[PDB]
Amino acid sequence: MNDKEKIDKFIHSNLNDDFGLSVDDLVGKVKGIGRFSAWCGNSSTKIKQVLNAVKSIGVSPALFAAYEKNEGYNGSWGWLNHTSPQGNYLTDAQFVARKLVSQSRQAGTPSWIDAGNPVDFVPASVKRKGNYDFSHNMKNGKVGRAYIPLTAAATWAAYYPEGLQASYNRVQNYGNPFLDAANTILGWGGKIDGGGLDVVARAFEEFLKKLQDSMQWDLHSIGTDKFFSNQMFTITKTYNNTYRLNMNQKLLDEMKDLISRIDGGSGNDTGADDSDGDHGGKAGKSVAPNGKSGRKIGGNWTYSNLPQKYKDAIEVPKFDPKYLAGSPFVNTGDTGQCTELTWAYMHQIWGKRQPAWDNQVTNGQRVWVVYRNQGARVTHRPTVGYGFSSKPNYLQAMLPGVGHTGVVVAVFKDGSFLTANYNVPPYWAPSRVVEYALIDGVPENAGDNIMFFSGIK
Amino acid sequence: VTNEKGQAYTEMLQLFNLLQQWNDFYTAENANNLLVACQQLLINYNEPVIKFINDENEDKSLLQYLAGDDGLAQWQFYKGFYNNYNVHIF
Amino acid sequence: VTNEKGQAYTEMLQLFNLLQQWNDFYTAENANNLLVACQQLLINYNEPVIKFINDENEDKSLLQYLAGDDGLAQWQFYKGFYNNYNVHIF
Amino acid sequence: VTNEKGQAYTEMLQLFNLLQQWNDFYTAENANNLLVACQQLLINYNEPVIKFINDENEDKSLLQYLAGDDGLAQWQFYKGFYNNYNVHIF
């Protein structure tokens, strides 16, 4: 890299560019250098404090250290030359770092004339090119934006390096701030140059391994030569020399559940009658699971922005926050959780304090178990006034092992239903904002993936 | 008691700074998403998160502490978490 | 013990979300500063901060809980805090 | 007359550059607010602003020129100004 290429890449580097040098790399190199020696007493600890402070404000420790090395030490001046010291070493370093960050973003023009010795010698053609580069090519937050406006020496170093010589400027020989800083950083070893998809692949490989694991278990004889099945696969004789390999329904469920739900797949848990048994229940309307797994077909509306047709369809009283008061979830740090809404809203609908726990972790997927253990019925039918428990993929459940819960507030002739929810986007816990979501019916074989429970009576 | 509250604030800042390496912070919405994602990780997966924060290994994965060595379980957890919080936790 | 750690995580997230209303989050640097500021407030001024988080008044001020009703004391506290963390706490 | 217009533009640029050190510029809205704030300062507080611009002291404060040495008056002025323009003038 020639000196012009070094200056060009260096002024176009970000003000916060590490230049391939860590704070630990610089601490040994800046011992004996100006204010690091005079103010920090060559203390590795004090030097690290200054370099970390300038880094946190958005200034490169390597750039700040290279500047101090080239500029030299004047006792009467702060870390920025021609400034008084501001408080102690650290306070002054933080002040200078904030000034450089502000200047870099600041509206500015290259300082073509030295304020102290005003001689206009730079060709108007050079000034036009440097002004164009500084205004159009040099983005905010670059090293050049921080230094080129501050001094004529910096402006000449960037766009007219010959102007640093007394021959051209007619005053004195000036140092090259950009080349000297660049050479110092390079001398120190610094360099100037100017998504879970794999997880998807690993998941597939695991499934292939899971296929091997299913096969590990030995087959049994089903009847005679006709069949030889276990609990995952069926070997069925087809002809004298033929056997076709079928697969046991469990196997399909065994891994199909794994596809959507990581654990607890479907337990073939005790369920409720297909009949709504509205008489059997306290009241409300229900719809049969209709297949079409689907998911949320609309939702997360607050009561104010809920579409009127869905607002008219709500068959339960609007949630009253007074039921939340005295909530057991406040003490546990679970304020605004979907389980807290389920507890408070079911208390409002059923007129009795509902259960929050059964001496086990209660979460969206399992809250139906807590209610069932207290005599709360439960069904695979979305029923108005009933709580729901959903493992991930269903009714807005996003986290495996946590699931989601809420209350069914309306059911529709097409078998879709409206749910009231807490802790869903955009209002996460502990917001306690009630959000209404339209759900696309229920899969016939959801099982414990989706459970609808009543309130205790 | 004073130490426990200080420790919880340190654990939250450490987790936030680690996850920030894999998450774009250009938008204010994402910054809020990572804050919510970190507090839900500490509340629901405290012991795994504390093991991950205190691991000095360069190849450490929070997914390994949360879902074990099974890549499919890690993928299912990650996909569910990312859908809920729009946050990377690799 | 489990509840106390969960509560400290909730208090941190609540304070962060409240202070975020007065602090621009466009830069990553400002986001780290607010996270540190919230931790330092909860560590050194836990009781005032918990009163402020649990206050439902629209005109509630964290400075009133930290420095009392004296506007000069509130200003001196605010100026020292803003100089140290570059964070608004009005 | 020609000198007076040039001087006012220099004073506006000098004030804008000084206040820019305490104000994040990442957003266009903040840049517009600082422009209006500088003009309102030069229109309503010209003499204090010209003293502040021409002060070479490192610890110089525009609030001291605008509200005097009383920290409560400086706070009340700063709070009203920040509320109206969303701009720092420390």
Numbering used by the authors:
A (entry chain A): 1 to 194, 211 to 473
B (entry chain D), C (entry chain C), D (entry chain B): 1 to 90
Copy the relevant paper text.
Staphylococcal picoviruses are a group of strictly lytic, short-tailed bacteriophages with compact genomes that are attractive candidates for therapeutic use. Here, we report the structure of the complete virion of S. epidermidis–infecting phage Andhra, determined using high-resolution cryo–electron microscopy, allowing atomic modeling of 11 capsid and tail proteins. The overall structure of the Andhra virion follows that of other phages in this group, with an isometric head (capsid) around 500 Å in diameter (vertex to vertex), connected to a 400-Å-long, straight tail surrounded by 12 appendages.
An AlphaFold model for Andhra gp10 revealed the two expected domains (GyH and CHAP), separated by a helix-sheet-helix linker domain (residues 211 to 277). The three domains were individually fitted into the tail tip reconstruction, revealing a gp10 dimer with the N-terminal GyH domains at the bottom of the tip and the C-terminal CHAP domains at the top. The two α helices of the linker domain fit into the connecting densities between the tip and the knob, with the β sheet penetrating into the gp12 knob protein above. After fitting the gp10 dimer into the tip density, it was clear that the tip contained at least one other, primarily α-helical protein. After subtracting the gp10 density, the remaining density appeared as a flat disc with quasi-threefold symmetry. We generated AlphaFold models for each of these proteins. gp2, gp4, and gp5 were a poor match for the tail tip density, but gp1 had a compact, α-helical structure that could be fitted as three dimers into the tail tip disc density.
